[PDB]
Write a protein that binds this DNA or RNA. Structure first.
Lengths: 87, 745
RNA sequence: AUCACACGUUGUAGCUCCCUUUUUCGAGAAAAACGUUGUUACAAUAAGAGAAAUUUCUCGCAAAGCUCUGUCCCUUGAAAUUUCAAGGGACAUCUUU
DNA sequence: TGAAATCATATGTGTGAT
DNA sequence: TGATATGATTTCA
């Protein structure tokens, strides 16, 4: 459905990923790629604080980027899957 | 009937043997049924010695770095266009950067210097960084750009680094300060296009860097575990960390807090708990952490909140009342949790006390063919490939003869793992608890040498079959005839045929990394700069400027002769030609009539790997159409065949008068018949110039061809050229017959 | 496994060194093309694909495998030597990815 | 005078964190 | 530190 910052982890489950594996090659790969990338960018959205090279204000801006862009990446993967038969 | 036999097998870096051996009720081996060898690749880079996957890893890292660099350049261009600055940038951006400190910088110049700052960010290498930073603490050098125009291009003459020499490296913070000071002066100098929001965006671009995620993407998704069917518990929770701790009297519960990491003194690090401890003691909030230490559930919700949400508002709303304002604010400044444990929170609650006091989960809530060797548990690639080929041979032998009785290993953390896997994953038809028995080949091979077959191992692949045949003791004439001879039937079941692993992969390196020029390619030559450090006499005689400009050519001859052709020593000092210019690299022609048009057609690089060759016939002739990885990537099916004395522009093109015979991949069996001699071997390579095929003898006999390969043998006047195929056991050699030319995609 | 930095190479452009050619002014130089030393900047840094829609994401030199799709072999059987049924393999242009 | 062997020859690199 | 593409140069029918 509509992916937000909070409910990101409730759609980006491993069950949906394993359900996305029955698509044809020309469609599965672009969708599974947008799925893993959204998870990677989101699963490490707080890693900007583990390093002392970024100020708190700066790492805050990189956190918003690593969340808002990863939600968009997950939305496209779900939207394309909805256009497909996975829905 | 279902014959009982000992399998035997001989692991290797690039060759796995096998030898089916007759047995009886008393398990004393007898006359072997049939043997063979399964040769494959070395599973390592032959030159470097590293892993095959490491080259792909470095190439993918370079691709990602280039893509993200051009992506951040596009973002910078978008920002500059949005501020109506970009709307062919000046190339003297170092001098323009220094000029930005004093007097306003124009639109195009400011855009050029900002884009240069975005592309080159900075931070041997460290020595140069520290040296430039120390030299940056002086009034004269107000910035790295000023350090480059006033100090770098006076003593050296070049601003950028060259052939290493990292003494010119700068820092990310130093260039950040450059950008900040340039914005400050430009605003002081009345530059309209110096908004603070632009400064913030460009500083974010300069400082942004994708986190080192690594790991496995599977673990980062929120499962459900199907036990309690709610959700999946976070890996960095107290219960999950206790799960991996309890599994790995009562005095040991407090011990993980007794030390940050465990060592041999009192023997698993509780990384998340100690991380929270360090973050909490970082401030002066010691009072609140005392209460948090005792509570395990509060740590559980902290772990779930941080490993399931990532935005500040999300954790703030999820842990509103569970934590005070200062402890929460300090918690959301250094913590970063990810990944999940395989169990659930409620399941962890049920199972932890009983594990402390899979069995807890149970009490609260094929064989015929050897299965695939686990790829994740085995990390070393060469042993992985060896075990893979071993199991392929095992499956083939079981399919051909039935289930074996015992499997023994001669080796040739590896043998033990294979023995355990075969014992605990394969049916087998042994007697007792010795289903699999590995052994050392030294004493066994000495005892076999008492039978008189030692000093036989040569570069040919048939010697490897001895390591697997020796399974009988852990007669000599019989095995000698069966293995070494090429016709045991006419001398005394089948001759041993080395079944090289078919390398029918259609992907690989598109072209060589050294890119040359394609401006003058229609002459069949390419022009590439090479350093004087490795310029010999032949490359000097191949110089493009032999007759254009004679004076440099003669002086280079004299200097090379003065230092006796050693290019490194001859030009270790700056060469001075007429006019005072220095010479480090000079364009040198090279014969390039074949290659790949790369860099969007600007350059040309040599072909790197043949994936397929299409054999053809035309009026009693035989033709070879080479297909390369770049042609497969481009979806091109070539129809020009290899013909001597002519370049690819004019090749004899296969038309409707030409009948396709078969498509050949590397390491495929072929039969070649001609007036001179007929031979059966594996297609190793096609010479694009001479048109010959370098077919190699199956066993790579040194007496046959150059070190095993029948190089340069032609097919243009071959009576019959046919493609053969064989099983992975070197059995059932037959004639193949393709019907259609399969496309290369 | 992962992220960056510094090169290097190729194309373009500016300046720069030496220079072959075509002329002009008239030994020496102004102009034009090409080669090209050094230096800087930009573009690319596999060849390229897939799905959306001036641009974005993923894959793109490796390994393993048969869950899917293929090129063949091996067995088996039905219909007019051919098409097909089912099972088992070798591989991959297919899956992990 | 083309077809087949023969012998050569080049082939991207170094640094610093996660 | 080695397979791999391929070019010059001979030798053969």
């Amino acid at each position: 459905m509509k992916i937000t910052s909070s409910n990101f982890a409730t759609i980006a489950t491993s069950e949906n990923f394993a359900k996305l594996s029955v698509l044809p090659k020309n469609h599965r790969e672009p969708i599974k790629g947008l799925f893993k990338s959204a998870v990677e960018q989101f699963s490490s959205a707080r890693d900007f604080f583990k390093n002392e090279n970024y100020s708190k204000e700066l790492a805050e801006k990189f956190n918003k980027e690593a969340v808002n862009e990863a939600v968009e990446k997950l939305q496209k993967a779900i939207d394309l899957a909805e256009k497909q038969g996975i829905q | 009937k279902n014959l009982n036999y000992i399998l035997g097998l001989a692991l290797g870096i690039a060759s796995v043997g096998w030898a089916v051996v007759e047995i009886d009720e008393k398990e004393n081996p007898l006359r072997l049924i049939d043997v063979g060898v399964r040769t494959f690749e070395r599973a390592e880079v032959p030159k470097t010695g590293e892993s095959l996957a490491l080259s792909r890893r470095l190439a993918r890292s370079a691709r990602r770095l280039t893509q993200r660099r051009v992506a951040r350049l596009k973002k910078a261009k978008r920002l500059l266009k949005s501020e109506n600055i970009l709307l062919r940038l000046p190339h003297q951006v170092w001098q323009l950067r220094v000029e930005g400190l004093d007097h306003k910088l124009e639109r195009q110049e400011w855009a050029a210097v900002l884009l240069h700052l975005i592309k080159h960010r900075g931070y041997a290498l460290l020595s140069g960084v520290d040296n430039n930073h120390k030299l940056l603490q002086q009034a004269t050098y107000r910035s790295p750009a000023e350090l480059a125009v006033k100090k770098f291009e006076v003593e050296e003459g070049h601003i950028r680094n060259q052939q290493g020499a990292y003494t010119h490296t700068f820092s990310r913070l130093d260039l950040l300060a450059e950008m900040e000071l340039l914005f400050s002066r430009q605003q002081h100098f009345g530059n309209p296009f110096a908004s603070e929001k632009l400064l913030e965006n460009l500083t974010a671009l300069l400082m942004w860097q994708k986190p080192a995620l690594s790991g496995e993407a599977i673990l980062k998704m929120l499962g459900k575990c199907t036990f309690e069917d709610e959700y999946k518990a976070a890996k960095n929770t107290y219960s999950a960390e206790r799960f991996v701790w309890i599994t790995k009297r009562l005095a040991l519960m407090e011990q993980p807090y007794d030390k940050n990491r465990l060592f041999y003194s009192q023997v698993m690090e509780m990384k998340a708990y100690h991380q929270i401890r360090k973050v909490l003691e970082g401030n002066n909030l010691k009072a609140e952490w005392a209460e948090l230490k005792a509570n395990p559930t509060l740590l559980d919700e902290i772990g779930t909140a941080f490993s399931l949400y990532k935005t500040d508002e999300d954790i703030s709303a999820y842990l509103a009342g569970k934590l005070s304002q200062p402890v929460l604010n300090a918690l959301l400044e250094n913590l970063s949790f990810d990944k999940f444990i395989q169990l659930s929170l409620k399941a962890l609650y049920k199972l932890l006390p009983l594990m402390q006091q899979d069995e807890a989960c149970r009490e609260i809530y094929n064989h015929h063919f050897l299965p695939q060797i686990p790829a994740d548990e085995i990390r070393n690639p060469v042993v992985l490939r060896t075990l893979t080929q071993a199991r392929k041979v095992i499956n083939g032998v079981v399919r051909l003869y039935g289930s074996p009785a015992r499997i023994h290993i001669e080796t040739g953390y590896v043998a033990r793992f294979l023995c355990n896997f075969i014992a605990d994953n394969m049916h087998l038809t042994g007697e007792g608890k010795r289903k699999v028995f590995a052994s050392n080949g030294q004493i066994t091979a000495l005892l076999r040498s008492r039978w008189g077959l030692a000093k036989s191992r040569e570069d040919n692949d048939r010697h490897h079959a001895l390591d697997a045949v020796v399974v009988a003791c852990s007669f000599k004439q019989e095995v000698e005839i069966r293995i070494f001879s090429d016709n045991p039937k006419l001398e005394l079941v089948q001759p041993l045929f080395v079944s090289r692993m078919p390398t029918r992969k259609m992907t690989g390196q598109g072209h060589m990394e050294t890119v040359k020029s394609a401006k003058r390619l229609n002459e069949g030559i390419s022009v590439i700069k090479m350093p004087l450090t490795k310029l010999k006499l032949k490359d000097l005689e191949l110089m493009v400027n032999r007759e254009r400009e004679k004076d440099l050519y003669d002086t280079l001859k004299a200097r090379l002769e003065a230092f006796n052709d050693d290019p490194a020593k001859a030009f270790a000092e700056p060469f001075i030609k007429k006019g005072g210019a220095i010479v480090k690299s000079v364009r040198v022609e090279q014969i390039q009539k074949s290659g790949v048009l790369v860099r969007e057609g600007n350059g040309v690089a040599d072909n790197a790997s043949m994936v397929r060759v299409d054999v053809f016939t035309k009026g009693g002739k035989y033709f070879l159409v080479p297909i390369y990885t770049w042609q497969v990537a481009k979806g091109i099916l070539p129809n020009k065949a290899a013909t001597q004395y002519k370049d690819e522009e004019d090749w004899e093109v296969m038309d409707n008068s030409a009948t396709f015979k078969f498509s050949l991949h590397p390491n495929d069996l072929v039969k070649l018949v001609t007036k001179k001699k007929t031979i059966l071997g594996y297609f190793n390579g096609l010479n694009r110039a001479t048109g010959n095929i370098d077919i190699k003898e199956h066993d790579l006999d040194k007496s046959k061809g150059k070190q095993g390969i029948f190089e340069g043998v032609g097919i243009k006047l071959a009576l019959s050229f046919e493609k053969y195929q064989v099983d992975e056991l070197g059995k059932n050699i037959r004639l193949c017959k393709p019907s259609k030319r399969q496309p290369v995609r």
